[PDB]
């Protein structure tokens, strides 16, 4: 059921409480659920269920803190989902806070009074000395409520770095990077790191290991907050997003390219975030061209993911009060939609487009049924398009554009033909 | 070696003696499976090529395959059969086409269903190219109508439209609210198709909250959607919303898990794979339960829903914790699912990977929850705890241990056996 | 002298026995990897020593020992890197040893859930095995033929799992996936594969395009005896991703 408590050396990020911090937490949290599912070592999850990540960080002043509240808070020198022991498990600030020093169900205090006597009685008055000193290093994490932890100091005869990180409060590279990030955040006043970590994050898939990549990138991503492969790409998207929330059309073009060049899992993640990113950085008059254009483009592997984005953008317009664009961009684009070559696919794109544009409840809700039947053209696929077009033709469109609608349908009727039996 | 060599030599003789036929009819009527099996040997290939050049011989060959099709159904033998029905005589086109629709197409081996669809299409094209006399004589009215009725009463006409349209080419010689949307979502979600479960979950989420319980608890609702419904509803709960979908799915999951436990025998005995059915009045009831395909596939489907609930219950609102009245019925269901999977190994083969996973998911999570642990660790569940140990040990060896190997290398008797099993 | 490499590898075997005692034999929760840092340092020195002696086949053996230790100690993403180092050091002088080391890298990537890395390594294996082991001097020689069968089945399952878009879909992938269809050729298309396995892989590549979920369930139990455990895991991932996709979060 359990793994060891952690108490990270880093404190909560202040920037996350702001307007541009809350909306960042929603979008970067979607990317976090997916980086966890793709590369977590899953050491505290036995079951396959993808989205069950947790960290063993108890609240103190108790119950475990949720993973979605621990964004960038876990120690950078720990690989994602690793729950095993390391030299920094519990921070110096947590032993000062939880035990009031400020310079469970078991009698662990008596176990800690013991051994502080017995080990001192062997190492104060070399194999046993080395293993007993190791034992003191480990067991010091359960020392509470004492001057007698200074018995460690008086008992005198990676290197120093798991130690310098206490005094300032692949295994060599991890702790050396963690030292560098902690200095830059807490002791800024007493730029080469930020350069050479970018060099490490731009080597080959083999010259920079995956656990070195993800830790250094999350290190730089923490330095940007506080105002002080599919998985390698998903991590790089997090660094892009935290920059965007702390040239805009270039920063969106790279996401549409991420959908077109990405594996279906990677593309499905980017298609979940893209609606809110657009709303946070662009007015909907400028959005509407790109999102229709990338649903229609021949360099689009994933119409069924794009069909959920152009539903968010239309439903946003249809609820913010700018209800003109959810007719005007439909009438502008329906020539391009009707003239795309593969007929079942073109008809299915229009069934999505009109479902997404609709007035009512229910016809906004039917979209997963339409997305289910991608590429089909049975009786139910033509009949749905007739009904969904009859919703648009009644409740949206004036006779001059209603004649424009008739004219573009006639230009392809020569499944489109049976609309002329119900539009009249 | 003699059995096959003797047939091959006899095919060589009959191929050199085609001026008479009594030996050709014997070889087909008695050795059709061996002729097909050896069809790659040159004399048998030449003999197949001779049967292709006489109408009565090709007729006898089709009748012989019709008479052994239940043993020719294995993939290699079915391919070799189709390789021996390509090139068959033109006068037998209605006979071989009748064989292709009646006995084939229905096979789960999708490549062989495509091979036979193409061969069935190539034969209707030969009947369309021939004269009306001597084509209509090979398949008349009523016979063609029984072919097309079979293709439409099965799913085959929708799955093989080139064949169905070629048979037609030969034969000629307005928008309600809730009460429509509920009917439309019923058409998708009240049938056993697993092709669109995430889209099915999204659709049932937009049924209004008061109707969900009736829509889910009905006998036609797809149980495969319960795990999707719980997983989708948890996204609403983790956003700080109430989820009518999570609540309905929780009550339907627990109601079904409880309801199938009432079908079990009232008195429980340890499941022991080595020699069952000494208390025959218990084991005959388990055979009647676990051998029924409608009960058996309900268990790992409900276990998928149960495991999806048990993995989240630690981070839910206290309102949604396991009812203390259900804690015995969950342990009984978990045991009965591990027993059912073990029974399927004994009498059939490996269970479906997802179904093995679903049973083991429930077992894993039920031993992690301290309330369910307290039930199975109690004295009155000793035979249930012993069933878990016996079933898990049996599943582990049936997957991991070859015949002639052991799991390790360089107080009724069942309690002592359960001790030795957990220790190794 | 060269006996320094013997001293360093015998020292590394002592440190790896200490790490195996702590992590595998005792399963101590108090372990933090100090013996493994020492093992990686002594084998690193002996690897560089063998390379300045011009013995890259001896350096590769020490890379394999560390990779095997990392895999056995629960670090498969790290082990895959040293298995690929071993393959690179062997390849110009021992092509079949390099294919053994790449096979262990691909197994380690599958343990690490690095499916696109595994797909690339198996593709490199299938290329090298045709280049070094499939000539008249055409059909493959027996040792290479077993590698070719492994790669083909695994790549087909990985391509059915990952489903790459255009331009990620290499000529090598398109060409493999073309074979797993049928149209016009009956009156031997199985290639290196057993014919029973080939017809079930054909059927699986077709059932996944059609999303024919009940056919994939049927094929998964029929293929279970024919596949390796690693390949049965891949086929489970294909059926799992078909019934409940990743990247949706819900």
């Amino acid at each position: 059921v359990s793994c060891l408590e952690q108490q990270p050396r880093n404190k909560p990020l202040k920037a996350l409480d702001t307007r541009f911090g809350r909306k960042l937490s929603i979008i970067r949290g979607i990317v976090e659920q997916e980086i966890q599912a793709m590369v977590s070592k899953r050491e505290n999850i036995a079951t396959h269920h993808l989205y069950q990540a947790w960290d063993p960080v108890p609240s103190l002043s108790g119950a475990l803190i949720s993973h979605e509240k621990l964004l960038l808070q876990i120690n950078p020198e720990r690989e994602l989902g690793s729950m095993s022991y390391k030299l920094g498990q519990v921070s110096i600030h947590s032993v000062w806070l939880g035990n009031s020093i400020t310079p469970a169900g078991v009698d662990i205090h008596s176990c800690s009074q013991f051994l502080l006597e017995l080990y001192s009685r062997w190492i104060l008055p070399a194999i046993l000395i080395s293993e007993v000193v190791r034992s003191l290093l480990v067991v010091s994490d359960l020392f509470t409520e004492r001057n007698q932890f200074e018995l460690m100091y008086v008992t005198l005869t990676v290197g120093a770095l798991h130690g310098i990180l206490y005094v300032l409060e692949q295994q060599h590279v991890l702790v050396m990077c963690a030292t560098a990030f902690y200095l830059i955040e807490n002791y800024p006043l007493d730029a080469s790191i930020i350069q050479m970590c970018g060099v490490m994050l731009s080597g080959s898939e083999e010259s920079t290991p995956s656990i070195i990549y993800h830790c250094a990138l999350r290190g730089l991503e923490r330095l940007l907050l506080s105002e002080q492969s599919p998985h390698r790409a998903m991590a790089a998207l997090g660094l892009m997003l935290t920059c965007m929330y702390t040239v805009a059309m270039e920063r969106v073009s790279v996401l549409f390219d991420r959908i077109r060049k990405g594996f279906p899992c990677e593309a499905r993640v980017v298609a979940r975030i893209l609606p809110q990113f657009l709303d946070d950085f662009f007015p909907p008059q400028d959005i509407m061209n790109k999102v229709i254009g990338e649903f229609l483009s021949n360099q689009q592997p994933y119409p069924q993911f794009m069909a959920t984005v152009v539903y968010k953008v239309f439903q946003t317009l249809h609820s913010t009060g700018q209800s003109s664009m959810v007719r005007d961009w439909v009438m502008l684009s329906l020539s391009n939609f009707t003239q795309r070559a593969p007929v079942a696919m073109a008809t299915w794109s229009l069934s999505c487009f009109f479902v997404s544009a609709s007035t009512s409840p229910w016809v906004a809700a039917i979209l997963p049924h339409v997305i289910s039947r991608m590429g089909k053209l049975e009786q139910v696929d033509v009949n749905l398009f007739c009904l969904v077009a009859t919703d648009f033709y009644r409740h949206q469109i004036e006779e001059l554009d209603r004649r424009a609608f008739q004219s573009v349908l006639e230009v392809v009727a020569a499944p489109y033909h049976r609309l002329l039996t119900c539009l009249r | 070696i003699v059995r096959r060599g003797a047939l091959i030599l006899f095919c060589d003789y009959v191929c050199q003696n085609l001026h008479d036929s009594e030996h050709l009819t014997w070889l087909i009527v008695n050795h059709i499976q061996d002729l097909i099996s050896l069809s790659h040997e040159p004399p048998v290939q030449d003999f197949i090529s001779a049967v292709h050049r006489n109408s009565a011989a090709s007729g006898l060959f089709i009748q012989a395959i019709q008479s052994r099709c239940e043993n020719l159904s294995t993939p290699t033998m079915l391919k070799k059969t189709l390789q021996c029905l390509e090139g068959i005589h033109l006068s037998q086109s209605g006979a071989v086409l009748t064989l292709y629709v009646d006995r084939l197409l229905c096979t789960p081996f999708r490549v062989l269903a495509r091979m036979v669809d193409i061969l069935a299409c190539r034969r209707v094209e030969m009947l369309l190219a021939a004269n009306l006399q001597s084509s209509m004589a090979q398949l008349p009215m009523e016979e063609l109508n029984r072919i097309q009725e079979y293709l439409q009463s099965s799913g085959l006409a929708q799955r093989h439209q080139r064949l169905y349209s070629l048979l037609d080419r030969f034969r000629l010689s307005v928008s309600p609210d809730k009460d429509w949307y509920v009917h439309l979502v019923k058409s998708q979600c009240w049938t056993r198709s697993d092709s669109a479960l995430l889209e099915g979950a999204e659709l049932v989420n937009r049924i209004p909250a008061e109707d969900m319980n009736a829509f889910m608890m009905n006998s036609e609702f797809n149980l495969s959607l319960l795990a999707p419904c719980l997983s989708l509803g948890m996204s609403e709960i983790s956003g700080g919303q109430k989820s009518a979908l999570f609540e309905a799915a929780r009550e339907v999951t627990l109601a079904r898990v409880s309801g199938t436990v009432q079908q079990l025998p009232a008195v429980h005995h340890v499941f022991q794979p080595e020699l069952p059915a000494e208390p025959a009045a218990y084991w005959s009831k388990l055979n009647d339960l676990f051998g029924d395909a409608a009960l058996y596939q309900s268990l790992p489907t409900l276990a998928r829903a149960l495991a999806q609930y048990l993995v989240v219950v630690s981070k839910l609102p206290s309102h949604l914790h396991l009812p203390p009245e259900k804690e015995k019925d969950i342990v009984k269901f978990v045991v009965a699912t591990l027993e059912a999977l073990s029974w399927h190994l004994i009498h059939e083969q490996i269970p479906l990977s997802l179904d093995l996973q679903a049973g083991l998911d429930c077992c894993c999570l039920a031993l992690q929850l301290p309330g369910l642990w307290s039930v199975v660790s109690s004295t009155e569940f000793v035979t249930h705890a012993c069933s878990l140990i016996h079933c898990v040990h049996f599943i582990l060896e049936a997957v991991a241990v070859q015949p002639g190997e052991q799991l390790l290398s360089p107080n009724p008797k069942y309690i002592t056996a359960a001790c030795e099993m957990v220790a190794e | 002298g060269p006996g320094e490499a013997l001293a360093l590898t015998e020292a590394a075997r002592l440190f790896l026995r200490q790490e195996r005692d702590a992590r595998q034999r005792l399963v101590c929760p108090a372990a933090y990897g100090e013996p493994l840092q020492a093992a990686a340092s002594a084998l690193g020195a002996a690897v560089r020593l063998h390379l300045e002696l011009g013995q890259p086949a001896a350096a590769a053996a020490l890379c394999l020992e560390l990779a095997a230790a990392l895999r056995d100690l629960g670090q498969p993403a790290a082990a895959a890197g040293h298995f690929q180092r071993a393959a690179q050091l062997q390849l110009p002088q021992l092509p079949l040893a390099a294919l053994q080391a790449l096979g262990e890298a691909a197994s380690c990537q599958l343990l690490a859930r690095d499916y696109t890395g595994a797909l690339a390594v198996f593709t490199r294996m299938q290329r090298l095995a045709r280049e070094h082991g499939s000539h008249p001097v055409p059909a493959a020689l027996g040792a290479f033929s077993d590698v070719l069968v492994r790669c083909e089945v695994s790549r087909v399952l990985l391509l059915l799992l990952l489903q790459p878009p255009p331009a990620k879909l290499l000529p090598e992938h398109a060409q493999t996936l073309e074979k797993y269809s049928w149209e016009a050729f009956d009156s031997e298309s199985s290639g290196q594969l057993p014919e029973e396995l080939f017809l079930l892989l054909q059927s699986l590549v077709m059932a996944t395009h059609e999303k024919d979920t009940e056919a994939i369930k049927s094929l998964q139990v029929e293929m279970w005896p024919l596949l390796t455990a690693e390949q049965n895991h891949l086929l489970h991932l294909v059926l799992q991703e078909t019934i409940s996709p990743s990247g949706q979060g819900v």
């Binding site: 592997p301 119409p303 079942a344 991608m374 590429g375 089909k376 | - | 489903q163 878009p165 255009p166 398109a174």
Partner: peptide, 17 residues
């Protein structure tokens, strides 16, 4: 009546359906 779609080979498209 299924075919492969021109813009993505893993998408099926329909002619006789």
């Amino acid at each position: 009546x299924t075919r492969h779609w021109q813009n993505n080979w893993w998408i099926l498209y329909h002619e006789f359906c």
